[PDB]
Structure 1
Amino acid sequence: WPYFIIDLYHWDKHTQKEKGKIALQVNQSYGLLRDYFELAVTWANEEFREMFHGPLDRITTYGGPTSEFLKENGINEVVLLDPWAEEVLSEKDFDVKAFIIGGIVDTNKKKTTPKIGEELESAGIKVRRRKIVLRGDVVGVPDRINRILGIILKMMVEGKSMDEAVYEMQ
């Protein structure tokens, strides 16, 4: 029912190896979502479509800004999965019609995801910045795009607690 959007913002600033890792994690995110239930990829340029080794016809790919995609589908509020957020994701956020995971890979960390939120709010989108924690700490939480999606799906579909979902995906 809800959209799981992978924001490919930052794409052209990545190396070819990092692009391949992002595309792989998107492919794994699709197969994982295929084992549950609606996967959307914004800023989805032609190079990503060429690197994506999965069924492009089975996912939603939008080449332009995430905000435009959200507005075209009547979504004014989203949940942005952000490890730097101060508030933890909870069941009070599962009524939102779109969850956004940043198409980001590290090579050592940097504060990259909240810039997506600032961009969305600058375009008029209400953004709930939500972090996933294990025992109140982001340490131990896998940050791969597919792993974050798996944690969310285990909480939303299987009713697992966050600690259970994180540890199972850890």
Structure 2
Amino acid sequence: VPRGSHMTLAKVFSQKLRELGISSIYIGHERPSLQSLAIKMLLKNYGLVEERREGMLITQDHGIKLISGKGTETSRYTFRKGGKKVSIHLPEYPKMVIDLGLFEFLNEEEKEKTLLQVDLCLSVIRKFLWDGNLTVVGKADYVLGRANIVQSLSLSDEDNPVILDPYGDVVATDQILRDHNVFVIGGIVDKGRRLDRATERLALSRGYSFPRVKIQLRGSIIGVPDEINKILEIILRVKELDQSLEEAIISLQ
């Protein structure tokens, strides 16, 4: 599941490394992606250790060389367990919002599925961004890593949301997804539309209306996942991997 050249978390991590003059890192067995390395440093107690090493050039990610094993490249910093953290400016955008305002209107099968799907969204977000870009709204009691849990949607001047809905009137294109920075996935209800109830309460109260977008494959909902965690990964494959919407949908089968 290969990396993008321009991942948000990678951008901010490399900003910081250039600031420190570090243009090369020995990564050992780690995945050659600054986004994955960021995740390990933030969550799993990894950091940098000063040491000279030589290795082969695996990849170069926003101008930072990632090397391992043996070869002619030099590094002065080595990524490993228990090394020093560096501070990165964690990205606000994009924001993924799961809207569980509908939870109590759901039957028992729908609840069980939903909770699993939402749980799995933590692993999805850790693949492309990190926990803090995921928000769950409408169940104040939910816990999910370092994801933001809020009873109600608190919404800023700069949020530019689109709601994912199979019964939306706008067809999704890579263009429309590129132009939004906030995505709201509710739960399927009455085996029909995808209901974002907490977001709806806020919108109805303030006279906002957010575009509602259906994802199609070749002019149709045939082939397109209805799992929350897979919708999420589609969005992120388009936004962070510059993958086309069509190929993003194929990837999730």
Q: Is the 8 A contact 1:133 1:162 kept in 2?
A: no
Instruction: State the SS of the aligned residue for 2:218.
Output: coil
* Cα distance, 1:127–1:30 mapped onto 2, change above 3 Å: same
The structure number with the bigger radius of gyration is: 2
Letter in 1 for 2:193: K
Letter in 1 for 2:114: I
Q: Is the 8 A contact 1:155 1:161 kept in 2?
A: yes
Alignment partner of 1:83 is 2:166: yes
Letter in 2 for 1:162: L
What 5-or-longer segments of structure 2 have no aligned partner? Answer: 1-92
Q: Is the 8 A contact 1:79 1:98 kept in 2?
A: yes
Cα distance between partner residues in 2 of 1:76 and 1:24: 27
Q: How large is the Cα RMSD of the aligned pairs?
A: 2.3
Alignment of 1:14-163 (within 5 A): 14-37=106-129, 38-46=133-141, 49=142, 52=143, 54-55=144-145, 58-64=146-152, 66=153, 69-70=154-155, 73-75=156-158, 77-90=160-173, 91-102=175-186, 104-105=187-188, 109-113=191-195, 119-122=201-204, 123-163=206-246
Deviation at 1:29, TM superposition (A): 1.1
Q: Percent identity?
A: 31
Q: Is the 8 A contact 2:234 2:245 kept in 1?
A: yes
What 5-or-longer segments of structure 1 have no aligned partner? Answer: none
The higher relative CO (CA closer than 8 Å, separation ≥ 6) is in: 1
Instruction: State the SS of the aligned residue for 1:61.
Output: strand
Cα distance between partner residues in 2 of 1:118 and 1:23: 21
Cα distance between partner residues in 1 of 2:237 and 2:177: 14
Cα distance between partner residues in 1 of 2:138 and 2:107: 17
Greater fraction of residues in strand: 2
* Cα distance, 1:4–1:31 mapped onto 2, change above 3 Å: same
Greater fraction of residues in helix: 1
Q: Is the 8 A contact 1:84 1:114 kept in 2?
A: no
* Cα distance, 1:141–1:120 mapped onto 2, change above 3 Å: farther
Cα distance between partner residues in 1 of 2:121 and 2:182: 15
Matched pairs, number: 156
Cα distance between partner residues in 2 of 1:135 and 1:117: 29
Superposed structure 1 runs of 4+ greater than 6 Å apart: 114-117
* Cα distance, 1:127–1:105 mapped onto 2, change above 3 Å: closer
Q: Is the 8 A contact 1:117 1:127 kept in 2?
A: no
